[PDB]
From Swiss-Prot, chain C:
Membrane topology: Peripheral membrane protein
Role of this protein: Subunit of the V1 complex of vacuolar(H+)-ATPase (V-ATPase), a multisubunit enzyme composed of a peripheral complex (V1) that hydrolyzes ATP and a membrane integral complex (V0) that translocates protons. V-ATPase is responsible for acidifying and maintaining the pH of intracellular compartments and in some cell types, is targeted to the plasma membrane, where it is responsible for acidifying the extracellular environment.
Subcellular localization: Cytoplasmic vesicle, Secretory vesicle, Synaptic vesicle membrane; Cytoplasmic vesicle, Clathrin-coated vesicle membrane
Tissue expression pattern: Expressed in brain (at protein level).
Assembly behavior: V-ATPase is a heteromultimeric enzyme made up of two complexes: the ATP-hydrolytic V1 complex and the proton translocation V0 complex. The V1 complex consists of three catalytic AB heterodimers that form a heterohexamer, three peripheral stalks each consisting of EG heterodimers, one central rotor including subunits D and F, and the regulatory subunits C and H. The proton translocation complex V0 consists of the proton transport subunit a, a ring of proteolipid subunits c9c'', rotary subunit d, subunits e and f, and the accessory subunits ATP6AP1/Ac45 and ATP6AP2/PRR.
InterPro entries with a match to the protein in the record: ATPase_V1-cplx_f_g_su, ATPase_V1-cplx_fsu_euk, ATPase_V1_fsu_sf
UniProt keyword terms in alphabetical order: Cytoplasmic vesicle, Hydrogen ion transport, Ion transport, Membrane, Synapse, Transport
Keyword Endoplasmic reticulum: no
Organismal lineage: Eukaryota, Metazoa, Chordata, Craniata, Vertebrata
Primary localisation category: membrane
Protein name in the entry: V-type proton ATPase subunit F
Organism the protein comes from: Rattus norvegicus (Rat)
Pfam families with a match to the protein in the record: ATP-synt_F
Family: Belongs to the V-ATPase F subunit family.
Swiss-Prot record, chain D:
Subunit structure: V-ATPase is a heteromultimeric enzyme made up of two complexes: the ATP-hydrolytic V1 complex and the proton translocation V0 complex. The V1 complex consists of three catalytic AB heterodimers that form a heterohexamer, three peripheral stalks each consisting of EG heterodimers, one central rotor including subunits D and F, and the regulatory subunits C and H. The proton translocation complex V0 consists of the proton transport subunit a, a ring of proteolipid subunits c9c'', rotary subunit d, subunits e and f, and the accessory subunits ATP6AP1/Ac45 and ATP6AP2/PRR.
Function description: Non-catalytic subunit of the V1 complex of vacuolar(H+)-ATPase (V-ATPase), a multisubunit enzyme composed of a peripheral complex (V1) that hydrolyzes ATP and a membrane integral complex (V0) that translocates protons. V-ATPase is responsible for acidifying and maintaining the pH of intracellular compartments and in some cell types, is targeted to the plasma membrane, where it is responsible for acidifying the extracellular environment.
Top-level taxon in the UniProt lineage: Eukaryota
Residues the entry annotates as binding ATP: 144
Protein name listed in UniProt: V-type proton ATPase subunit B, brain isoform
Tissue and organ distribution: Expressed in brain (at protein level).
Localization of this protein: Apical cell membrane; Melanosome; Cytoplasm; Cytoplasmic vesicle, Secretory vesicle, Synaptic vesicle membrane
Coverage span on the entire protein: 257 to 506 of 511
Family, similarity comment: Belongs to the ATPase alpha/beta chains family.
Length: 204, 218, 110, 250, 204, 204
């Protein structure tokens, strides 16, 4: 009646269904599509599906876990910024917010009416997430490698040197699954991985 | 006024509990901010008292060194006051983010060139060199004391603001949420009684219709 | 850019800090200090203090503790956090903490 | 193990009978056959929803939040078929599992259950989203009878003290994580950094277990001591110095 | 029952009636009578009455509009004041706050058990309101004109220099409709208008 | 429920019962057994018991009154202690806090597992509280009588001249009616009273 998941139809459904895609008024209002809240939704089938993923997509389970972790640490960091602003945030917390913005705005977000986003195949999906989280790991390493060192590689030094790679990362969503087949998409994303590694190597 | 005017529903109970956790979290975060700033403010006050004691000593020594300079140099003061050009010592402002707040401070910077380099060549120049160094030490301690003052006044302001936010959460926002939640729980128990009463009457009507339907077969 | 210190005090206090390297003329030829004679009026010290605390170049004002007490009204009225005011002792004058405008603002101090 | 399955589409009256079979079998195994018995009643919420239907079947008027007035006695008739009895080695323990409606303990299903049962364990969405499996939040959780369960000759003699000190260090670690969020790392003390290192390692070694790794109480206590050893010996304020001298060294 | 306007008799009544004079227990506790809450209350007949007011009091619709603006700005400012105290307000905001309190205490309150407030003829009503809103406009103009320069007028300077005017404005209720004739009340209120104009001209 | 006393069974019970013993988790977590909160607890029967007390224990009514006052001053002073530190309080406040600590830790706490706290007879209860409040009245007299003089008394001066009296006061809980006859306990308390009076005679 008001989007409330305590309503008896939802409560009875939730005791039965193995998957629940909790769409959220705040996301729908800000026109975030497809409006799924990534901290309320769940899928009890992960246990079973991990057999298929470990046969066909061995990188995906690590990425899936790191994604939800990054997105939950986004809620922690986003709540405290209302009071403290940026002043307490570690350089790793900045890298967490930057990648959480990429994952929220350029991976989770998807336009249901525009041909570039009407449907997204799994090879595109895993490749997008692989790149965004490989950036998180390499950026987090670039910061933490300089802990107590004579000079710190800051989030801003990263963000400035990686600016082309950040634009490429956000651009991954634009590949057309019809004209750009999975082979071409995987090849382009493999070039993004190499470019990403080499851009980080300039600071290590 | 006394309540948030959210209309009572099982949804509204959930939203008020979510907001209460929000307000209690914001209270504790702002209380941690207040504690951290208050710790720095007490430390900075301790440093002010210590630095004013050090300032008393360096100023006694420097002021005594003026008597020494007046011994061997005569009235050098009129020459020093009248001839002024550029400051050998200047301050630059700087920001400290300690305790999750911006505190302004000053740094002691020195330009090399002595604006009174030749003063005392006729007499007193040895004692004037000692005097120059003593007042330079006084200025170094005063730049630190100013940094403590700018920090202290900025913490006084920031603690007053933060404690007002904490007390506004504790005495306005949380009480509005708690009264609103108690009201919503009350009106939800009222709606539960209306449904109990309505359903008891329905069951009574069915009992009467069952009895009448049996009596009509006799 | 930097800022400069300024002084309001007797000839000896001013002379000491000038030899400490504190003194500069502004582009308008006005100094960053006032020498106070025993016959100086409250308006001379106070208008100077009101000028110094509002000028763009001055970041710190040093006031001799005796003068700081003679101007106590305008001094304790100065609430801005950046242009700092230091009450300082002098050779024939009260000690560094006498009626100090900052020490009096603390609740934690006895 | 004896396993009873009642499906979501199985009849609502068979769902009421399922706990009663389980407890009747557990009563037989313990009190007729001396077995120590652990009963795992996996969703007391769907049992309570089945009671709601059986009450509607008698045309009874609904009570508190739409559940029957006698819901406390029916939950008690399930939960109190448990305990040890004089002159028998058998004993029925129960670990019910209970899906809290709307994530709120105030609801009659968890609320009446808290009144009847001896403490509760909370699974927590916060730990779940952080991938801490099992997602068991040890801070709001309380096993009420743990003072009986732990002692010399039942476990290592240090155990109660270890749990108390782990509780304090995890609670203080959470409080220091709230401080870090406001002040940033450079404003923290060395001790605050130890409670943060403790919190990180404690979630990632003590609480995190995985679905098939089995830890006996002895190995859980050695893990506990491996986390407590992060602090200097004198910081372990809820452990006696005799216990520290016997177990703090690693 | 319980002073709650959600009660079904109230709810059904407000679905029908065209005027709502909601009485607030919190005003009645403070012995502010009539206890009509001016935010809650409404009249739907105002459009139908403006055609009458223009035949007798062309100034009235301007004054009624400005009265609601003063009270609305004060109620909105009060949501800040309740959380920060009386300290951070602008001088215009302090004028708004204090004139809204003048309007609350000396226009909206009326002591119906006394010779001066037993009844209030409509001429006294427009007169009192005209003087208080004239004070508001002049006080606002004085600050907004001078805040652009070193010689800034303040709300305190207005209060201190015009304390007799604030007392005179507050006194306006005590005029006795039986003894003070309509002409005499209008003349006394015109003296207040001129006293204000002379005092603001002395601040300018 | 959750410590909420507004539930009708609890609210009615505390409305009916003439006495409430407010046990508190914050006290039991510190092992402060019996863990009764001395602010939240109450008893209406005092007016009726005063007949018995006036006959058998005539001194007790003054003592219980002063005890509640000392405990109330601790709770009210504690806010100032947090705000400005204990060292910044007045001498009359400092001695008040120390006696409140002495009462809290050595009178109100009672370890019923030990041989000495196993049971506390009413005579022992009066004698303990009589000595603690006698020490308070003498300490209060010494600090207040010397206030504004050249020569002045403070808690440190008292403790330096008579630290054995504070130790003897704490020892009173260990005196056991099974080992020591009631006359012996009464004589020991008469000795502590004479000892503290002679100790204060060195200061005043």
């Amino acid at each position: 009646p008001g989007g409330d998941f305590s309503d008896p139809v939802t409560s009875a459904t939730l005791g039965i269904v193995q998957v629940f895609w909790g769409l959220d008024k705040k996301l729908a209002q800000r026109k975030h599509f497809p409006s799924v809240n990534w901290l309320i939704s769940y899928s009890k089938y992960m246990r079973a599906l991990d057999e298929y993923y470990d046969k066909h997509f061995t990188e995906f389970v690590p990425l899936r876990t790191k994604a939800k972790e990054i997105l939950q640490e986004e809620e922690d960091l986003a709540e405290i910024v209302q009071l403290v602003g940026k002043a307490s945030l570690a350089e790793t917390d900045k890298i967490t917010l930057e990648v959480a913005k990429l994952i929220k705005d350029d991976f989770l977000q998807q336009n249901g009416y525009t041909p570039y986003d009407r449907f997204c195949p799994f090879y595109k999906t895993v490749g997008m997430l692989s790149n965004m989280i490989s950036f998180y790991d390499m950026a987090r390493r670039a910061v933490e490698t300089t802990a107590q060192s004579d000079n710190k590689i800051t989030w801003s030094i990263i963000r400035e040197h990686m600016g082309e790679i950040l634009y490429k990362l956000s651009s991954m969503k634009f590949k057309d699954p019809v004209k750009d087949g999975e082979a071409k998409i995987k090849a382009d994303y493999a070039q993004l991985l190499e470019d990403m590694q080499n851009a980080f190597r300039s600071l290590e | 006024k006394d309540r948030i005017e959210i209309f009572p529903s099982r949804m509204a109970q959930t939203i008020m509990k979510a907001r209460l956790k929000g307000a209690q979290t914001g209270r504790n975060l702002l209380k941690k901010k207040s504690d951290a700033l208050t710790l720095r403010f007490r430390q900075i006050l301790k440093k002010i008292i210590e630095t004013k004691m050090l300032m008393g000593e360096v100023m006694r020594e420097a002021a005594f060194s003026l008597a020494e300079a007046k011994f061997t140099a005569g009235d050098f003061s009129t020459t020093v006051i009248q001839n002024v050009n550029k400051a050998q010592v200047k301050i630059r402002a700087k920001k400290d983010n300690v305790a999750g707040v911006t505190l302004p401070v000053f740094e002691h910077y020195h330009e090399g060139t002595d604006s009174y380099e030749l003063t005392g060549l006729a007499r007193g120049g040895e004692q004037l060199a000692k005097l120059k160094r003593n007042y330079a030490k006084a200025v170094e301690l005063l730049v630190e004391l100013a940094s403590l003052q700018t920090s202290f006044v900025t913490l006084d302001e920031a603690i007053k603001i933060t404690n007002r936010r904490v007390n506004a959460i504790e005495h306005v926002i949380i009480p509005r949420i708690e009264r609103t939640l108690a009201y919503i729980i009350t009106e939800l128990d009222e709606r539960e009684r209306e449904e109990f009463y309505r359903l008891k009457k329905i069951q009574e009507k069915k009992k009467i219709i069952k009895e009448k339907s049996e009596k009509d077969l006799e | 850019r930097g800022k400069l210190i300024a002084v309001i005090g007797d000839e000896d206090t001013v002379t000491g800090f000038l030899l400490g390297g504190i003194g500069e003329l502004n582009k308008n030829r006005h100094p960053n200090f006032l020498v106070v004679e025993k016959d100086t009026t409250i308006n001379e010290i106070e208008d100077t203090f009101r000028q110094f605390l509002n000028r763009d170049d001055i970041g710190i004002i040093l006031i001799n503790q005796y003068i700081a007490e003679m101007v106590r009204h305008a001094l304790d009225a100065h609430q801005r956090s950046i242009p700092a005011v230091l009450e300082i002792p002098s050779k024939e004058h009260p000690y560094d903490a006498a009626k100090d405008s900052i020490l009096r603002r603390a609740k934690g101090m006895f | 193990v004896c396993l009873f399955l009642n499906l979501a589409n199985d009849p609502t009256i068979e769902r009421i009978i399922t706990p009663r079979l389980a407890l009747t079998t557990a009563e037989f195994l313990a009190y007729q056959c001396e077995k120590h018995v652990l009963v795992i009643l996996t969703d007391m919420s769907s049992y309570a929803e089945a009671l709601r239907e059986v009450s509607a079947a008698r045309e009874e008027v609904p009570g508190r939040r739409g559940f029957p007035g006698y819901m406390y006695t029916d939950l008690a008739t399930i939960y109190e078929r448990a305990g040890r009895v004089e002159g028998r080695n058998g004993s029925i323990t129960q670990i019910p599992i209970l899906t809290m409606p709307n994530d709120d303990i105030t609801h009659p299903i968890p609320d009446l259950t808290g009144y009847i049962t001896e403490g509760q364990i909370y699974v927590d969405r916060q730990l779940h989203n952080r991938q801490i499996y099992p997602p068991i939040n040890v801070l709001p959780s309380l096993s009420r009878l743990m003072k009986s369960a732990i002692g010399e000759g039942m476990t290592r003699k240090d155990h109660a003290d270890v749990s108390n000190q782990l509780y304090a260090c995890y609670a203080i670690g959470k409080d220091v994580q709230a401080m870090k969020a406001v002040v940033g790392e450079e404003a923290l003390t060395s001790d605050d950094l130890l409670y943060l290192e403790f919190l990180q390692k404690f979630e990632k070694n003590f609480i995190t277990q995985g679905p098939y790794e089995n830890r006996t109480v002895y190995e859980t206590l050695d893990i506990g001591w491996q986390l407590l050893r992060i602090f200097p010996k004198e910081m372990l304020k809820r452990i006696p110095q005799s216990t520290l001298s016997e177990f703090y060294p690693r």
